[PDB]
């Protein structure tokens, strides 16, 4: 049941406006509203508060940027009431430290990466050119080149002085150090011809490709012998900066987010010169908290607890769910989709009354239930450890309250798969073979079975009729509920569409069961009379056309509930056949390679577990999502999501 969501109107003076918006934002259970057009101004806030707002946003952005620079992630904490320039003196030195160190070490890694890849060719050409460092007669064209194609680049030197003009590659065969030395203009033109044959001079950034090679090689030796020490020390100092700055910086981040949220919501008011007024929405189970919070102020400044205006002109109303706590943890599973419109039916209790009971009819293996109970006790130990669940393969990081809801749905699901593993009679596929624990008359060993599910002459017609019968109950409940919601708002087309689909569907079902099912064509024909008469009456008193092609898809939606028995038989006899092959070919072939067949059947059984339990877990909830939720509407105008004053904490 959606909460009735009353209206809250307040007024007063403006210093008290900021103070009561503080006291309303600390107890954050209220939604806001613009309230522009009548008798008040749009409330351009203040110039000095605008400067304070943009400075607070700069504080928040700088703190979060410092934190992401530090490498950790931004979680809230409890804030601290302290002065703004005190927050500046808290923010700026650690920001200066981390910013100077992330300049220093990142440019150090740049210089170290450009150094270590080119130490040895540079030192090699320095030992080769120790008779001419920067002598003013002949430039030294360096080219760290490929393998033994030295004549292809030395053809330019052959075009140059052949009995002179020393150009070769001595050693260091990772890259052949083709050095060329003749003159200034001779080496320039021969370097142009060698670049036409493919060549390039060592002109890099930093100090190597901007200075003479001897002293630059000495500087590269200096950086190679110095830089890992600074690597280790700057990692140590950033670790210390993390461990003794992250708490206070994310605390002031929480404070800054609170201040920015309050000031940006402060413009949602309406005032002139001797007072303001604002409007908001409060759910009805939040009235004593807001009442005692607003009892603090000046002369208990005047509240208007309006009962909200009704379903006409009601699209701007926020929506919540408010379900009893036995059905509570499916709110995320019903809120993957959109939200209702405050006057649409609360859809959430039917998924606890149906979905685990359908998943039991999907999965009828006691071994699957025991493995689910094992992962459930693991996952409840994980919420005992209070760790957020993280996996970077899926980039799935999520908080332990969702994980506790997952514990609840997993337990409330695994009970029904236990009881439908009992009734269907399958232990881990089929381990009734050795110990005949389940009683069929072909090998009666122990307690009987209710339905065998491996053969179809005994099972298929009964199970397929019950699988259609659940869809009959579901779809008739959905169409009756749409007729109810059309009866509520005094909107008549929804009522006619609901009663028309109901009459047409029961008429088609009666005609099917009569003229294609059994004998006794006498009693049901009056029901066919009634059903098609109601359908024609609806189309005549409706004029809401193109329902006539929908009734075929509507029978499709009442009939598409075969898939629960379909994947039930599929997964059931698949598991039974796998354990049958493994158990038989292990036991009756060898009698001591039985552990070989047992563990390979176990690992293939867990393989098909891991490879199709996602699919036949997804099937009942898509059955709900595309039959039942779309019968009674639920896909119109998206509602409006209730977000209160946060106070992020």
């Amino acid at each position: 049941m959606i909460a009735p969501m009353e209206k809250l109107v307040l007024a007063g003076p403006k210093g008290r406006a900021k103070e009561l918006l503080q006291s309303l934002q600390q107890a954050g259970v209220v939604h806001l509203e613009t309230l522009r057009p009548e008798a008040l101004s749009a409330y351009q806030l203040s110039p000095e508060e605008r400067a304070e707002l943009r400075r607070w946003e700069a504080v928040s952005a700088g703190a979060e940027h410092t934190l992401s620079l530090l490498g950790l992630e931004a979680e809230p904490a409890r804030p601290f009431p302290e002065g703004l320039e005190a927050a500046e003196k808290a923010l700026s030195p650690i920001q200066a430290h981390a910013e100077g160190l992330t300049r220093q070490k990142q440019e150090l890694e740049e210089e170290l990466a450009l150094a270590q890849a080119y130490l040895e060719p540079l030192e090699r050409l320095a030992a080769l050119a120790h008779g001419l460092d920067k002598s003013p007669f002949l430039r030294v064209i360096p080219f760290l080149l490929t393998e033994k194609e030295l004549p292809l680049v030395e053809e330019a030197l052959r075009k140059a002085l052949e009995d002179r003009y020393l150009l070769a590659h001595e050693a260091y065969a990772g890259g052949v150090a083709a050095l060329v030395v003749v003159h200034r203009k001779e080496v320039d033109q021969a370097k142009a011809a060698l670049s036409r044959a493919g060549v390039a001079e060592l002109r890099l950034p930093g100090a190597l490709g901007e200075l003479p090679l001897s002293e630059a090689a000495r500087r590269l030796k200096e950086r190679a012998e110095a830089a890992p020490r600074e690597l280790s020390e700057v990692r140590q100092h950033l670790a210390k900066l993390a461990r003794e700055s992250a708490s206070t910086l994310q605390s002031l981040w929480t404070r800054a987010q609170d201040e920015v949220a309050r000031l940006k919501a402060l413009e949602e008011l309406a005032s002139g010169r001797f007072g303001f007024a604002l409007l908001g929405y409060v759910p009805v189970k939040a009235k004593p908290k807001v009442e005692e919070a607003l009892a603090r102020h000046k002369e208990s400044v005047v509240y208007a607890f309006e009962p909200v205006d009704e379903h006409h002109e009601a699209d701007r109303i926020p929506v919540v769910l408010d379900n009893p706590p036995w059905a509570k943890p499916f709110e995320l599973l019903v809120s993957f989709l959109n939200t209702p419109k405050y006057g649409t039916f609360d859809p959430t209790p039917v998924v606890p009354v149906f979905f685990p009971f359908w998943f039991g009819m999907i999965v009828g293996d006691i071994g699957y239930a025991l493995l689910f109970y094992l992962v459930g006790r693991w996952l409840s130990g994980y919420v005992k450890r209070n760790e957020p669940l993280v996996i970077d393969l899926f980039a799935l990081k999520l908080k332990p309250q969702v994980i506790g809801k997952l514990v609840h749905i997993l337990n409330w699901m695994v009970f029904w798969t236990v009881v439908w593993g009992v009734i269907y009679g399958e232990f881990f596929g089929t381990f009734l073979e050795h110990l005949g624990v389940f009683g069929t008359p072909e090998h009666p060993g122990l307690i009987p079975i209710l339905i065998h599910r491996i053969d179809t002459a005994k099972t298929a017609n009964l199970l397929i009729l019950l699988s259609v019968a659940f869809g009959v109950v579901l779809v008739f409940f959905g169409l009756a509920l749409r007729a109810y919601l059309g009866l509520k708002h005094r909107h008549m087309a929804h009522f006619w569409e609901g009663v028309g689909y109901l009459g047409g569907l029961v008429g088609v079902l009666a005609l099917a069961a009569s003229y294609l099912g059994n004998l006794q064509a006498g009693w049901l024909q009056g029901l066919m009379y009634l059903g098609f008469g109601v359908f024609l009456l609806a189309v005549l008193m409706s004029r809401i056309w193109l329902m006539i092609p929908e009734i075929f898809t509507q029978a499709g939606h009442i009939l598409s509930h075969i898939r629960i028995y379909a994947v039930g038989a599929a997964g059931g006899i698949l598991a039974g056949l796998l354990t049958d092959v493994g158990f038989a070919l292990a036991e009756r072939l060898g009698l001591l390679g039985v552990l070989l067949g047992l563990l390979v059947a176990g690992v293939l059984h867990l393989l098909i577990l891991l490879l199709t339990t996602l699919g036949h877990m997804l099937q009942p909830i898509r059955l709900l999502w595309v039959e039942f939720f779309t019968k009674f509407g639920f896909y119109e105008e998206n509602g409006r999501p209730y977000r209160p004053f946060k106070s992020v904490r």
């Binding site: 008040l40 002139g272 010169r273 007072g275």
Partner: protein
């Protein structure tokens, strides 16, 4: 009573706009009285000086 609250705030806001214009008339009325008394005092002072 949201419409009543907006109506009451509009009535307030109007009544003290009237208070504000009454205040800015009254202050200038005090200014006119003060300058009239000052010019009368200067005239009496120079008349006493010329008679003496």
């Amino acid at each position: 009573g949201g419409l009543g609250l907006i109506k009451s705030l509009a009535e307030k806001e109007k009544q003290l706009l009237e208070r504000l214009e009454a205040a800015k008339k009254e202050a200038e009325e005090r200014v006119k009285r003060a300058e009239a008394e000052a010019k009368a005092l200067l005239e009496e002072a120079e008349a006493k000086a010329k008679a003496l």
